[PDB]
Amino acid sequence: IEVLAVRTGPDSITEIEAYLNPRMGQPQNEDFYGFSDNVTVSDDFGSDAPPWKQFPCYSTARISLPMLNTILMWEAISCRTEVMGVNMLTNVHSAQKRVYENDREGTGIGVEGMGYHMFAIGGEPLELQFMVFNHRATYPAEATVIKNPGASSQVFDPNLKGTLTADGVFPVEAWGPDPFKNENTRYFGQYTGGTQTPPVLTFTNTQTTILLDENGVGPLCKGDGLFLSCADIVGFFTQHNKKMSFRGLPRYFRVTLRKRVVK
Amino acid sequence: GIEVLAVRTGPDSITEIEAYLNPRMGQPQNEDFYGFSDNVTVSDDFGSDAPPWKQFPCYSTARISLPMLNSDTILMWEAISCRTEVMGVNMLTNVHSAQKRVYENDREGTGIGVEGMGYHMFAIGGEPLELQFMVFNHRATYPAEATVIKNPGASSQVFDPNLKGTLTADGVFPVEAWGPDPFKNENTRYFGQYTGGTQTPPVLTFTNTQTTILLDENGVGPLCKGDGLFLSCADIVGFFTQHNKKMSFRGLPRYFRVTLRKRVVK
Amino acid sequence: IEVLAVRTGPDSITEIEAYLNPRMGQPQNEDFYGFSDNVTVSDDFGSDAPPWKQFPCYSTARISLPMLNQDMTSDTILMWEAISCRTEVMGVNMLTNVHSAQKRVYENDREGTGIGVEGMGYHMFAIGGEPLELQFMVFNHRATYPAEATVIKNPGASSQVFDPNLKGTLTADGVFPVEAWGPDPFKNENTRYFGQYTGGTQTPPVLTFTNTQTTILLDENGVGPLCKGDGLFLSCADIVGFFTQHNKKMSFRGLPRYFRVTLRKRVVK
Amino acid sequence: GIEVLAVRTGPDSITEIEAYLNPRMGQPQNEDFYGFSDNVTVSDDFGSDAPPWKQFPCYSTARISLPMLNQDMTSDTILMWEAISCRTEVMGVNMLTNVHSAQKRVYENDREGTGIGVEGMGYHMFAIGGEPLELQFMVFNHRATYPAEATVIKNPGASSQVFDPNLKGTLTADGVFPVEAWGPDPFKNENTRYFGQYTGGTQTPPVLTFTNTQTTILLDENGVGPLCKGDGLFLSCADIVGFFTQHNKKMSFRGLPRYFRVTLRKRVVK
Amino acid sequence: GIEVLAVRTGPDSITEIEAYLNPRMGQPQNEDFYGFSDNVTVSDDFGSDAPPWKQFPCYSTARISLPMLSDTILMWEAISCRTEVMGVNMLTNVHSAQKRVYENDREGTGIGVEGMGYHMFAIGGEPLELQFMVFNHRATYPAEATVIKNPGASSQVFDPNLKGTLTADGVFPVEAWGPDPFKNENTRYFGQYTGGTQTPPVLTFTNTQTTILLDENGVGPLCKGDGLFLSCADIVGFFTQHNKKMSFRGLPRYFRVTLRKRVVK
């Protein structure tokens, strides 16, 4: 896109607020919303078939911007974003394996293990690279993936591309952001592994991310659409009988946009 | 929000207040375990989960009265900067008071001390902290003494836009049930750190040399409605483990130093 | 103190160097200097009486600065003002010792290195023109501290959190328990303090040392600590961790602290 | 050393290249365990130590051909591609959220819990230069007999367990210089920038970040980037994420591919 | 000390040296365990504590001869440096004869090097000035080591009498000697320590990091007798055999110093 001047005047700036609820695998408006189902493990790579509801998927939404029509596009210049409900992890009473399980004593162990925190702000869908731990994993039909993807899918294969077009069906473990594309998206990711890792979460309303590139240009919203994506896996919930499910948290978006003149 | 005009300069245009918030870990004031929760019990499942009063921490808050003031134009107090410290970090050097020993089998070694989660949040606002209700388990039956949303529904396990409140009382809002609402709180600044686990090493810092600016992007700080400065916090430091392995929350008090100035407004 | 003009030039700046040895509890000029006695633990909060030598105390010293004033009746006087400092934990090298009478990594097999010094880190220093102002605060109020220690007696349940009546000044070396006193943020206008706690009984000590790092001691107005009666007050506590013997007994280990303070002459009322 | 003169400015004075290096963790490409090493085996003593090919990881490298700039290579001065900045990301971090693919479970005794996922050492290094990455030979155990497929210094002295000034190399091929045997040589590499992090442990959880907003400047203290000789940009990296642990407790290295974006400008020289 | 006047800015006014220090973990040069200590034994008590020679590491040091050089003399002033720990790559070895993760099932990778980091380096115009300090003042150090004999109880903390200078390579025990902060006016020094026996080692390497050696008066270490003085200790962690015997492993350090001609006195 050929980028001309920032068009100033009244109603040249707009703010949107939005939230993505996590898609950890268990369904909406049932007792385990925000959790996955209990994780099963295969005996080998050949027979690996992870059941639906046992693994997280990316959350995404298209935010409709004020109607506009050289033309004007909305340009996203800055954002605030927050993981919400971090306060809930101070819960060590709700059906958790205890610190001293043998002695039937102590607090629950809380949420612990893997953390995966990622968000993207763009003017088109987030662009994805298929990459999996085990290529022979058979994903369920509810999921969007590349079927029979081959051994090369265990690392970077330039043919195995996609775009984040549906909320709660692109498995986190089978798709990542594509650094060969996403010129019109900003993406940010942090992974900390383990199964006994303590989660580390910060929250403040005073931190701003600038979305402008090296040329001072932000994501440009094609079709007057602003695209938000995340995954916010906090760790595992561990029950008394040692069963383990993913726990995730919702994510808050504030985005500021100004009118940009473009060819 | 409020239409903000010029900063008023002149004699006694600046004020400084100091305050503290004692923690509300669960056990009463004036009794032997003030600073602690009662011993934490754990339900078998989500469906019969009733955390009794005193076994969980609540938020601390206080309204500080500012000097009285007063047209198309009134003055308000504008919080421009602050200092805050967790106080009593020093007491965690205690490894002799009735603790699980690091070699309990052998009855030897120091106490294990306070270990486990840290939840450290504070808020400085010109009105009560606006809260988002969110719980690990929506079927948790909270006790009569706590302020919660009743029958929250399954969507309270994540974000649900209907489930709001305001931190209007000390020692009664369960930390596990309420968080700062990022869709509101334009007139409050809040800051928060969580580190999880149960045997996690606690890490506290303290110094009288650190200032946090409260001014937003347009250099407007929180403006104190009705001449009130609203201070909120929670300062879970970790868990205390008795000899017989029962575990309780331990908290510490927070100090606040807030510098305010007169601002002209509609 | 009405603060006026700084003095400039070559004669206007002085450096003092000092050290504080740790007060971990075992007496100086004995085999266990640097250490506490082996820690014992109470059965409950009520019968808690931590014996002398089994817990650390603050280190403190008043340094006497050049007396600047020939006459102290004049309308103004020179005061020393601390503008910058360097501080190092000394003896970090010693913690590479994994041979000296330490529970071994595989003690069941009587094999492997000593586990070395692990556990609680507590490192704070204060530089001020007057004693460090303290807030009394204890884990358990019913702990009866030994006669050798300076504490608030029968402090009450409120002393387990913030009580505004329970105040103090660090007025002596090796007697104010770390576990009962911390710096009071409601005071210390004339003092700068910094601390960090890292707990957890298996936690590895993390220590850095360099002669290249300065800490500026000027406040928001450009004013350093003003040394009242020509006194520079240095305070610290450096609990490195715990020494674990073969019989699983455990004592605090401390390290000494180096201080370099740069002072200039400040005119005052 | 090259005698460097003025920088060219304006639209045509800039070029950008995107590239990737896939890991060389030991197992062959186009087979079921590409991205992994073979199950690791451990020797009884230093003397008999002989790591089977596929069981240890090797460096990745590629030469990027840049547009040829000079019509007459006999000129007083000529143009050179000068690398001024890069972005690099580890790709496929996402896949580490897999705890169902045949991993030792956290409660193995009870056939319960998730997998333990990838755990343990991280070795993350990247290098960018106008000529191949220059290497120092240094090994844990000098008596290690490396297989024919690998490039090593043979019968290295006991001196090769520390710094020996004679034991030099160049990263001249992909997937054959073993990470455990070669490292960047700080006595050389004037024309390359390299960056590396080692995090040990066997239960150490991996910590990776990914963003398209992070730029590394490659200019030196005099404002000079790597100058690309024969119009070649050399990219080198190792990205050992940690170990995969099967049910039967056998462990292999898991690797991830690296993305490179390099911004270059025209520099006058000679 | 030295009264320093101006910087002679001319041609061949700036020089550069590169050097390495190999580590002195205890095992001799030109034998199979170069880079390691011998297997560490532990005393039963403080009063019967004698670390056998080779079981503990010593400081590395060397003097670099600089190009050779009245009411004012010229001196070499060190202005900037680079240092890297080398051979971090070797720590990806988990196959060389070490305790396995699952020793009871004879399975898994070697546990690799774990435990304590002690990384320091000093750059100066004279030998590094040392403070004696020991965990146990009653430890009996072998004849090969340079220590203060019968140091007394105050050597367990700071005693202003217990001074030394790092005058030799591989004989000053790390656990006995530290950089003296009451001296080293003409030396810059830098240390980090992480303790423990199972600690995950953390090492970074790059050739893009410069340290500025100048003081608050923009004066660098001045090289007396045209000698540049390098010192370090680089303990990475502990190597564990199948039989649970442990030894220190160290790594060599790279130095690059830029010096300029200073007029003095």
Numbering used by the authors:
A (entry chain AAA): 23 to 91, 98 to 291
B (entry chain BBB): 22 to 91, 96 to 291
C (entry chain CCC): 23 to 291
D (entry chain EEE): 22 to 291
E (entry chain DDD): 22 to 90, 96 to 291
Paper text:
Polyomaviruses are small double-stranded DNA (dsDNA) viruses with a circular genome of approximately 5,000 bp. All glycan-binding polyomaviruses analyzed to date engage oligosaccharide (glycan) structures featuring terminal sialic acids that in mammals are usually presented either on gangliosides, which are molecules composed of a glycosphingolipid, i.e., a ceramide and an oligosaccharide, or on glycoproteins, which contain mostly complex and branched oligosaccharides attached to amino acids during co- and posttranslational modification steps.
We expressed and purified assembly-incompetent VP1 pentamers from all three viruses by following the protocol established for HPyV12 and solved their crystal structures at high resolution. All three proteins fold into the familiar VP1 pentamer structure. Superpositions of the VP1 pentamers of ShPyV, GhPyV, and FiPyV with that of HPyV12 confirm that the core VP1 structure is highly conserved (RMSD values of 0.65 Å, 0.83 Å, and 0.73 Å, respectively). In HPyV12 VP1, the BC2 loop comprising the Neu5Ac-binding site is formed by amino acids T69 to Q83 (T73 to E87 in TSPyV VP1), whereas the putative binding sites in ShPyV VP1, GhPyV VP1, and FiPyV VP1 include amino acid residues T61 to Q75, T57 to E71, and T58 to E72, respectively. With a value of 1.82 Å, the BC2 loop of FiPyV VP1 shows the largest deviation, while the BC2 loops of ShPyV and GhPyV VP1 yield lower deviations, of 0.77 Å and 0.84 Å, respectively.
